[PDB]
Design a protein around this ligand. Sequence first.
Ligand SMILES: C[C@@H]1C[C@H]1CNC(=O)[C@@H]1C[C@H]1[C@]12CN(c3ncccn3)C[C@H]1CSC(N)=N2
Length: 393
Amino acid sequence: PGRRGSFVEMVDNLRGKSGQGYYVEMTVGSPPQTLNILVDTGSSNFAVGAAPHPFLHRYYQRQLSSTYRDLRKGVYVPYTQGKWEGELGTDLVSIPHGPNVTVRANIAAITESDKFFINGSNWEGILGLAYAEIARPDDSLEPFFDSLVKQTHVPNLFSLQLCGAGFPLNQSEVLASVGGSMIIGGIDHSLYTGSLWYTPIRREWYYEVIIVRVEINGQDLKMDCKEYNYDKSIVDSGTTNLRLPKKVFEAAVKSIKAASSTEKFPDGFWLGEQLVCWQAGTTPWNIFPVISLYLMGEVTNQSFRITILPQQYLRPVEDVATSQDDCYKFAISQSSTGTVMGAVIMEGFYVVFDRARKRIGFAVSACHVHDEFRTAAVEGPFVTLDMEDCGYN
Ligand SMILES: C[C@@H]1C[C@H]1CNC(=O)[C@@H]1C[C@H]1[C@]12CN(c3ncccn3)C[C@H]1CSC(N)=N2
């Protein structure tokens, strides 16, 4: 049967790119104040700029909202590479290109920050879509999606199609371009090809999953599978890169270098810091390997795999000269906090966050970048034993 798309009202509601984030339009307050909001599956707070900042063109003005409620409590969120801090309250919230509902939700009004807002990103706040366990300051602060489900008939599921262009976008192009879809309350069949395969959500905190096998061009990385999930593996639209635990990163980069050895790149490239450039149109995709992550299936002793191309893990960037060369950064990097399946991974796939059934679905994205010879893939099943043992305790 032909694939019908039954969520037209939400298709194409995102903008952005992997390096700066994908965002959706929201409104807060009465009368509605429009803000662009980063979709972040790796955190659980709805937090919006609420005071001037050099990188904000607008911000939430609580004094202008008749429906604002002050919770008279602060929240401070320091993290590895930045901080956000603010004041808790509630207000009415809508998603214009979302379900036709308005809900009362917690909002952290950000008053101070450090390397949080991104120059030219076009977003003014973040929508943490993960679970209450990791909400700040504590799990009593109900996340937005939990409020949405509790207050409306919206089904307890959302799905993301993040669409990488495969080439750089400036602020102008990125403002005019469709960056993907967030389907609130359903699955839109127009956004993917082939079958959806589901992996269990291991625990409802982050969107935690279990990786059971890794291959580079079909060659097994051959690590103890616990290494792949040390100390967790998560799906995080608020991270650019595929991030891998130190040991796994070292093994993966060794293998990717070996596969790509017909061309030599500086250390700075492999450290994700330095761009590589080729003459227009000549990027040698074929010398770079595909990468497969096998995920625990829903059936006992079954796994499936997702396969990405260099068109996913090489992130398009602009040159210093803004030349006609095609340039990229290596978007795989080291983690000390587990595997992070970030935006560059997610760009390969339509990802279904099936909270109701405690599972995450993957299918090949209708908007993934590929070439005439290779495409991204989601394939199964494989017989895989002792998969629970891959999880870290
Ligand atoms: C793809 C986009 C270009 C990337 C920029 N990403 C971001 O600015 C992300 C929103 C942030 C955070 C908000 N963070 C946090 N940690 C604990 C509790 C609440 N918030 C951590 C911080 C980094 S990782 C993450 N998923 N979310």
